[PDB]
Ligand binder design. Structure first.
Ligand code: MTX
Ligand code: MTX
Ligand code: GUN
Ligand code: CL
Ligand code: CL
Ligand code: CL
Ligand code: K
Lengths: 284, 284
């Protein structure tokens, strides 16, 4: 029953070192990897997350440009900025920090980012490439980070029974697609699923990205399961937990991500890696 | 208990009559819906399929342009034809009959079709739109036809435990995505799945697209299951069957598609519908 923590904090640190070296090379070729981040309005969490992303860029040799736009910006004004960034050869990645204001249509904004700078992998053509099984185009950061974490621990996915809880565009759908591409059998469950346990009790691998504290319990899993917790939930006490009942589920798991320090750091690492990927594409 | 045949042949015929009427009105306003079909080489099955598509177009007032190219044409020649068709305002849909010869890159050819005439829904941006749960593209004809057939019987998909056997780009992947969009829990099984029957025995709905005679047997399903058979397999005897053991599975099914006369006719009907949809878009 020897449980192993999937230490995304440690892996993300290793990746940042790797990127710092890549960036030294790129800079010697006259390429300064650069991520533009657009933050709209004054959402407090968003401020903090963007600051973290900028700090992570600086640590690994990526130039960051943060654009602080008014909460009342019109949709066309936001599109105009993205158009500018799309044509700026010095910018390799463009990220729009979510959530946008209620009066902005996310899907239209995201499709307006040039697909060659779409480091979140949200553009419809990048979604399409991934679903076609092509995994050289930009892949979304959170599920890509999960795949990299699993690969680092030498976890073989072929033939595995995998369950993804949550069917979001940001995580659940691309996560299922990456696992299917890797040869796993995949089930995608969500709030309308009649009985989650029917699926989870048979699973070799469970990815939980459902936004609900203690959604995954020990009686819902079999011994030896690999558990990946994408959840970030703040309790009334201020304690951060995932979507998994970690204390009990960890007892039954062969490998499990802690929260904090699991998926979270890996998502940032992949943002960085995707930006460096775009920058490297500029080499002759 | 009562079993009902999901009669795709009858539904398809009604759709064709509906499109013939729509095309009479379109033609009176100067638009003649037109599909270009490109067939490379002389694969006998392919020639049969193309003749079927051309016949169906004629039945519902769609003009067909069939380009029958030599198997030895270059990738460049094919691209050049598709470029011409992309720019021909009198052509509303472009379909390339698969498979292509080995020396032609399928992915490149499909992405070269302008997405607004991509009636097969294979272009990466159309795959992306579907996966994002958007309605701004073309959807692939086989899974779309399955959804239309289910809807014709008012089959409620929310919360259903669905299993899709086969993870192809033509059927399985978009099928799973359409079912997930409709609120079903979806499992995608394939050649690397350890125990297919574990999944099928619990399913409310099974879509089979595996190309294997008698893959789905009665001991693999529960009473009341809905079974959709995308297979078209020709026996030694000459009789056409699906991937389902229809004689036995039908006894346990609440709804089941016969073969022939189930999915097959609907796939063609959706091609015609997608073509007319494109033509209707071109109105001033
Ligand atoms: C894992 N994760 C963190 C994550 C990863 N990449 C990001 N990328 C960007 N550009 N912005 C983010 N806030 C972001 N966040 C997630 C996961 C799910 C949802 C999500 O589904 N939230 C919204 C959808 C999108 C939104 O935030 O507006 C919702 O429907 O409730 C958001 C972030
Ligand atoms: C699990 N999940 C999706 C998700 C789905 N349904 C939900 N439902 C509820 N009620 N609450 C949620 N938080 C929730 N979350 C997540 C996971 C992480 C983050 C998150 O940390 N997002 C930060 C940004 C993180 C980043 O920038 O990468 C944000 O502000 O959106 C959001 C949603
Ligand atoms: N173009 C094309 N479309 C399809 N839809 C279902 N099968 C096929 C095929 O072989 N080729
Ligand atoms: Cl959900
Ligand atoms: Cl974290
Ligand atoms: Cl048929
Ligand atoms: K009946």
């Amino acid at each position: 029953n020897a449980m192993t923590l999937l230490d995304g904090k440690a892996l993300s640190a290793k990746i940042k070192e790797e990127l710092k070296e890549k960036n030294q090379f790129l800079k010697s070729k006259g390429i300064e990897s650069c991520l533009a981040v657009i933050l709209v309005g004054d959402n407090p969490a968003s401020q903090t997350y963007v600051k973290s992303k900028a700090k992570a860029c600086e640590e690994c040799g990526i130039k960051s440009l943060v654009y602080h736009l008014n909460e009342n910006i019109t949709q066309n004004e936001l599109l105009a900025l993205i158009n500018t960034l799309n044509h700026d050869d010095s910018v390799h990645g463009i990220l729009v920090q979510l959530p946008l204001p209620d009066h902005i249509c996310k899907d239209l904004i995201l499709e307006s980012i040039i697909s060659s700078k779409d480091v979140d992998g949200f553009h419809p053509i990048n979604v399409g490439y991934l679903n076609l099984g092509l995994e050289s185009g930009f892949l979304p950061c959170t599920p890509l980070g999960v795949m990299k974490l699993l690969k680092a621990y030498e976890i073989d996915l072929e033939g595995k029974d995998a369950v993804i809880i949550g069917a979001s565009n940001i995580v659940g759908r691309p996560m299922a697609t990456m696992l299917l591409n890797a040869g796993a059998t995949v089930s995608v469950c969500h709030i309308k699923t009649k009985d989650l346990s029917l699926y989870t009790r048979q699973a070799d691998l469970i990815i939980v990205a459902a936004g609900c504290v203690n959604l995954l319990r020990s009686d819902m899993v079999k011994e030896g399961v690999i558990v990946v917790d994408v959840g970030i939930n703040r309790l009334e006490s201020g304690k951060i937990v995932g979507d998994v009942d970690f204390e009990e589920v960890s007892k039954k798991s062969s490998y499990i991500t802690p929260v904090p320090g699991g998926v979270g750091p890996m998502t940032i690492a992949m943002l960085l890696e995707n930006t460096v990927k775009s920058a490297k594409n500029r080499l002759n």
